[PDB]
Design a protein around this nucleic acid. Sequence first.
RNA 1: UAACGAGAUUCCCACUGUCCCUAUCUACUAUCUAGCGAAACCACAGCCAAGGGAACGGGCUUGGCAGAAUCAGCGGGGAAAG
RNA 2: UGCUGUAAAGCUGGGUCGAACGGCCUCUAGUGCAGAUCUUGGUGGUAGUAGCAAAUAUUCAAAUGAGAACUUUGAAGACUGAAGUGGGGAAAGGUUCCAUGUCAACAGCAGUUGGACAUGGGUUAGUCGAUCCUAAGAGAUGGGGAAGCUCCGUUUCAACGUGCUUGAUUUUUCAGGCCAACCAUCGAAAGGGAAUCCGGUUAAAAUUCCGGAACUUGGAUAUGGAUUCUUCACGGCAACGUAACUGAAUGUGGAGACGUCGGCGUGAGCCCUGGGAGGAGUUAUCUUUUCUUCUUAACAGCUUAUCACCCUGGAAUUGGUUUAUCCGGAGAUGGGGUCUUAUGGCUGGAAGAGCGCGGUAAUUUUGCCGCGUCCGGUGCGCUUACGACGGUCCUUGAAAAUCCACAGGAAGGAAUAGUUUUCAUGCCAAGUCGUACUCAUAACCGCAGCAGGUCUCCAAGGUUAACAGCCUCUAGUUGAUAGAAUAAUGUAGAUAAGGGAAGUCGGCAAAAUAGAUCCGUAACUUCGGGAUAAGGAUUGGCUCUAAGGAUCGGUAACGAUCAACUUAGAACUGGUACGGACAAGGGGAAUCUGACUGUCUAAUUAAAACAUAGCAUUG
RNA 3: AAUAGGGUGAAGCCAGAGGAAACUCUGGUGGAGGCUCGUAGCGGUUCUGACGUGCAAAUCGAUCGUCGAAUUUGGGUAUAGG
RNA 4: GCGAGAGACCGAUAGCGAACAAGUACAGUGAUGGAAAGAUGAAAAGAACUUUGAAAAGAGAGUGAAAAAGUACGUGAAAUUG
RNA 5: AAACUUUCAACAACGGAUCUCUUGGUUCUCGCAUCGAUGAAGAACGCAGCGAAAUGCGAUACGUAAUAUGAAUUGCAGAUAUUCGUGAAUCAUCGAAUCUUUGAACGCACAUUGCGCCCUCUGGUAUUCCGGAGGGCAUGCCUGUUUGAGCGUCGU
Lengths: 86, 50, 249, 112
Amino acid sequence: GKGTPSLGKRHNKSHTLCNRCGRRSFHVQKKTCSSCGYPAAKMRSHNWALKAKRRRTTGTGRMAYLKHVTRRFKNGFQTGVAKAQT
Amino acid sequence: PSQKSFRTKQKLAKAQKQNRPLPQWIRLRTDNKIRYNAKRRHWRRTKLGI
Amino acid sequence: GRVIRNQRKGAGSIFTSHTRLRKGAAKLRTLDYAERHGYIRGVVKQIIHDPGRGAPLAKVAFRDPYKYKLREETFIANEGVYTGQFIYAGKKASLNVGNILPLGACPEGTIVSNVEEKVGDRGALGRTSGNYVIIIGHNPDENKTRVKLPSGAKKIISSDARGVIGVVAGGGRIDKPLLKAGRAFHKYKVKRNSWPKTRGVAMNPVDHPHGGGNHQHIGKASTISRGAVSGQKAGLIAARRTGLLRGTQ
Amino acid sequence: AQRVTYRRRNPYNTRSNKIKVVKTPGGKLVAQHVKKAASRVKCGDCGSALAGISTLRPRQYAQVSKTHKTVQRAYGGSRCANCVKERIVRAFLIEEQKIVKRVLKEQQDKEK
RNA sequence: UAACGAGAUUCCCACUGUCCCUAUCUACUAUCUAGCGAAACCACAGCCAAGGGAACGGGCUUGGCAGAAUCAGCGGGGAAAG
RNA sequence: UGCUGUAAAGCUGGGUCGAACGGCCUCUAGUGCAGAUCUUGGUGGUAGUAGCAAAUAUUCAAAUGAGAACUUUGAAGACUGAAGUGGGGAAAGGUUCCAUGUCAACAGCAGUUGGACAUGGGUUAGUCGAUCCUAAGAGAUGGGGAAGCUCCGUUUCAACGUGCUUGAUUUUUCAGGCCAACCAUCGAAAGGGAAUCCGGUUAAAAUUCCGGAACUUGGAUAUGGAUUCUUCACGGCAACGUAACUGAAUGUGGAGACGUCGGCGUGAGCCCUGGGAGGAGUUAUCUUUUCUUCUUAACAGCUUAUCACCCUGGAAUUGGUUUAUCCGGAGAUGGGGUCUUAUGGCUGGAAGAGCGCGGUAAUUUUGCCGCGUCCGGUGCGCUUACGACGGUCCUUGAAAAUCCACAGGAAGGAAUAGUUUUCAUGCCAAGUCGUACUCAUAACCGCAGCAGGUCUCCAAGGUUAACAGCCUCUAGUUGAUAGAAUAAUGUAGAUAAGGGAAGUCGGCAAAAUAGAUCCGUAACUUCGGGAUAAGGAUUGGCUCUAAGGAUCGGUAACGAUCAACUUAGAACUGGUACGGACAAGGGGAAUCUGACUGUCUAAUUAAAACAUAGCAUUG
RNA sequence: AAUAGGGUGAAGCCAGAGGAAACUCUGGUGGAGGCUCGUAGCGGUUCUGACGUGCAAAUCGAUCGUCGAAUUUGGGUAUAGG
RNA sequence: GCGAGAGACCGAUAGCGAACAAGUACAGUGAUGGAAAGAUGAAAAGAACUUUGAAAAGAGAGUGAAAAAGUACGUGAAAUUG
RNA sequence: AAACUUUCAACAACGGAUCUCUUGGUUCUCGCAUCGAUGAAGAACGCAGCGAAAUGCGAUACGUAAUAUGAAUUGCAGAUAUUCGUGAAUCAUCGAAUCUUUGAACGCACAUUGCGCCCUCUGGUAUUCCGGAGGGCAUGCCUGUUUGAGCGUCGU
Ligand SMILES: O[C@H](c1cc(C(F)(F)F)nc2c(C(F)(F)F)cccc12)[C@@H]1CCCCN1
Ligand SMILES: [Zn+2]
Ligand SMILES: [Zn+2]
């Protein structure tokens, strides 16, 4: 009754893909993501889930801009172009 | 279903292209460690969760 | 224990009223210049059934005194009101069934319905089928009128409060037995989720103060103090007396 | 006998998913989807169906000439003939009685 | 308390393998073969009688005895398994 | 291979192996395993054992191949039996679709086969959906709470328009005229809603492509027609008609827009059937025979209706009238008309299409020619749509976008010319996303190719009350490891002398009854029931008889023609059979208990428990 | 959005008979009901049947309750751990 | 976080979960949960060719210091097995 | 006596222990201060002559410019590629750029590749309609500008 026969009536997704994190944690009826908290301004994160922070944090993606801030700082945040040596 | 969203159809397009065997000229490269594509997926066995 | 059904009704999740089919709120006109100083005339267009109400409602069309417009009002139909009847409302309106008059303009003994508790609230008293308000007397010095409510209580209202002359239509509804659970189901299907009722003595001690025991019994007096708290007020609240009512009160 | 299928994705016998069974020039039997039946224009006074006015689905009234949607009379496509007749007589008699009540009133506004 | 009841109970008619008291028949197994091929469980293991013993032994003591490898059944024991 | 030590252990011979390691004096510790139902990994006995047994069932030959119970083709035998094992979809899956190749692993036997493996191919829209609307509801803003994450509120204590409409101006400035109750937004691939059909075509797509024929919306815009000198049309007593035939602000209405059941009527598709023109089958005998083709889309015109309405007239001797008794001096019957066009007919679309035959071309891309495609009938038939009615409720059975009409009379209009795109014709455009396939005893969820679960459309012949059961046509499958035997014990199913519950806690299980027609039917009762009470008789086949109707023709009470299955009776007849398979109540006399219909412990309790109407009390 | 085919035969209506009246009786018609037999459906009584390392972590077979409403059901939506 | 230097630290069941396409594969509606997996050889020199086989393979041969290193790859213990 | 069972040895299996490594981990110390509306962290989808992943990048897409260096890349192929040279390869360096759809995410909306409006240019006989290109339109708050509102209020 409550096992195999009832498990056959599962064809209505409670969650769909999230637009912020793309993870399929976006609750359809609540219009909220259970993973990242979208559409709230802040990202959902808790100190009681330290392993969850590992999965989605700085360094787990591309860091396409923070990659180069260290290299730009070491040169004093240069403006201009390089001069060819004589 | 036949009636699907663009976002759904776009995820299913990527899933087809990642579902291909290893090109064999890759096994001849120097210091190569990949023997086969380890991320294969069959439709009946593992679901996409899309 | 657990939160009892008494306390679950206040949150109002599944206990709100089913209002899809209702035909509008039944109210008198807003008290305006015409009603305060003279009278305005309207015509009854419809007499319709309002789901959840025993009294039929009347749709009465009035003219807007200030702009070229028609105003549709939802009145509670008094018995004898018909479609095409002219309804006159105001201080100078005449004493005819269906007319809306201030209480001071009605002689003693006048049977009036949909009476205003306060001047301009558009009707509070005697709105259910077969019910009405009797005018007991007037106090012109204090500008007050004494009325008798359907419960038998006497109330003092401003003589400027309005009411509709006659008895609310649809009376005698209670005289027929429902005869069926299905009839009560259909009765409450367009009112609210309050039926059927499980007896509290038939529950477990979590569910109700009356639950539990190796026989079904209340165990303590079912008359509960007025100063008791929510979750305790199950039974006869602040009962002045109990038992079969014998004689006059 | 040949059996038919719906021609659209709706598989349910709803009010807008009604079909007829039609034989085609190919000697076939296909389903033909039937639109919802039109309702008659009715009088604003008595509620009866107005004569002389085409029965169309509301957007289709835009696509027909004016003679199909009206009758050459006052309140032509709005009220029926009998309800217009009562308006004329009531307006005439009541306004006539308004004059008598005025002349009568002026008789009591100058002697008592 | 009429009507109703997959509610509990007693009696009567009809009916019958429920029984006296069992017999016979059919299909699928079981059985044998080709292919395929698990699991529970397992201190070591596996014949009895008495004795004593943690007071009901497969093992100890004293007797009876004791001959390869096995197949189908079976449900006494393993104070069987869970 | 041995030696040393009581021992923990140390050293050594031989084999294997390939890059580091030891003795002694000290330091240091994550330092010694047989157990912890220890942890992780690996391997046994059991054991070639249990088993691979639901869904009726397969067989012969040929081809392919190294290999065939299982692949392909042919022949046969079967099943699902239109409430399908058929043909589609919604959810869900995501390439499972199609072609070619292919068999290491998977398909609990096999495999040359596959939803497996590999390489490629494949989804075409102004008209089908989404998109738009609002539903229950969700939720910004102004504000008000809260330390705050945030909560409340959505007509709300707000100075809330990214307003429109014109004459314009080309001066990219303007002049004004009206309004702003309500109005952020999201919320339906089953509600509402602009518009497409037929024939053909692919290996796989088609209401999407090709051919033809249409339609809607938005824009531009000319010609014809129409109108005006009585400026913004005529006709009809009227209902109202038409090719058109000004109309601002504002207002009023209508459509969108609505439960359920009952019988009736009409149509459509299907079923049934006659003639004729073809084709196929049977032919020992018979059969003017059995089977089969003979079709007509969206769209345009004319015509077509119950209801409703108009004119005439004035009604008791009351008449008209439905299967169902409702209407009429508030105007019936009669006579004459108007309207809706649901539905049918004719014509165009359109025979040029499709279908069925016959004759020819050819490896042949692909064909070419000829003929026919016609005229009816029937009905308590089945399904479905609509219509006019009737019943029912202490139940009266959404909203909005959107479209139209009317009221109003602002403004602008002619004569040598003026207006209008609601009349006809013509020109341009319609973007975005989905579109393959499964929808299930193998494409979804149950760990799986699981006897479970999962919403819906179409529905042939016979028997019959029946869409039940049984047989068959179209379509689809023949899938489920197999072979040989037929012990015990089983599982599922049968029968049984005489007795008939003696068995057992207990008639548990089985048996008996069963359809229909006719007869007969008790106590008790809330008068409705009990009741199919109980208890009896009949039932096949064949040959007849009688009754029950329609349309025409003027004691027409008659003739002519046509037509559906219902009922009743009689004779004969037979191994006394006959609802012959299927289908299908056992009954009676009482007690306890709950009034009844209904509900719950998904997965051990369905009850006397819960609920209920009714009664009463309390605020 | 879905729900074969029968039985029974409530109001209302038509006709006839009896009666002084108040009224009564008979034959039709009609098609009511949380009525009834019984399919699909929904449920799950009994065999305390099968299976019980199953087809299945609740199924299979027969038997059975109910089957036009307090009915069954898709989707949307609301209610969230004292 | 960025950049460096170290250690009486661990040495692939240890040390971070991760020495490897590791927060990967995979599970769950979701929050979350979360592995296994290093080593041929100095160098592919990764076995040409003949022969049996439908093929996988086998037997010769060949490369290599070694095939007692053949990718099911250094050494190759025990259970278990011929 | 065979077979069978058990024990032992040799060889071969099963399996992956032991030994030896180690671009990894862990801990300690030293030095530094550098994310984002000038659009970050993160996500999705794409990009190579032949790529699935990892790594890199964004329609200029395993990268463009610049500076330095000085002859490669490499599994195969190939220059309309290069060698006493503005010249191979190079995240060597890096100061100039590109940066799809998003995301605090900003026209509104978003389970939709949904729906607007403004300016300039352009095509279709167009101030109004349809198509294309480029540039714009969020909220709170601050300073200032302009236009306003209120018998709150001063003057004539
Ligand atoms: O004061 C009495 C009264 C009664 C009632 C009644 F209850 F019947 F509706 N209505 C009255 C009315 C009335 F409202 F008009 F009905 C007015 C004045 C007196 C009335 C008496 C009764 C007898 C006649 C005079 N009025
Ligand atoms: Zn998210
Ligand atoms: Zn009218």
